[PDB]
Automatic annotation (TrEMBL), chains A, B:
Source organism of the structure: Microcystis aeruginosa TAIHU98
Segment of the intact protein contained: 35 to 158 of 158
Protein name: Uncharacterized protein
Amino acid sequence: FIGTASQSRVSAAVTSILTDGNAAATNSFAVEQVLPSSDYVFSGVVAVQVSYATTISVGVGTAGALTPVITAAELTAPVVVNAGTQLTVERATADAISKAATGSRFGDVSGIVRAWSAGTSVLD
Amino acid sequence: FIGTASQSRVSAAVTSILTDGNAAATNSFAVEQVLPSSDYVFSGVVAVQVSYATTISVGVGTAGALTPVITAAELTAPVVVNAGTQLTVERATADAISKAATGSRFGDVSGIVRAWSAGTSVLD
């Protein structure tokens, strides 16, 4: 759980404390997934499952107390292509470059790239 | 005869007053036995015997009056191991501790001892 500025992220945690008076067991599972937010997003059901074993003892051999532990954990986090249409200057500029390049007007592509990278023009 | 609150105890006494008009003799024997009542009890025949001597005189030498006295006394009080099965909380708790200790589950012994001595638990 370190990414505070991340834009597309799932975080989950499962914790437990089980006791019968004589024995106790504390278990936790934490997980985190992060995506490049301009390309993919999380959309769907987020799901966690854990698996507790009853084959671990603390004490004297097979006569020890039974203390359940987590030995397997899993996560679902559905990943979907980003499809938002709110406009940024960069996205519109890239779209204009693509439109110029589809017509083989590479001089216009060069002009736009010149204006973007250094703010110049053809006669400058 | 001082133990009023004792639970396993035998008390006995033999007294006599003998006279022929000119001489008299008073004799007594008192005895008491006390056991730890959780371990042993009295069960059987309680028996007392005393021994009177005819070799003691009061007066002028061998010409004195004959006054019998007690010079030996004895008691039987049969002692038997306590074998009652009425339940106390302490006896059942000790039995549970013994059962846990026979299986080398010393964590359970420790848990029961913790609950008995201070009323605590493992996570407290």
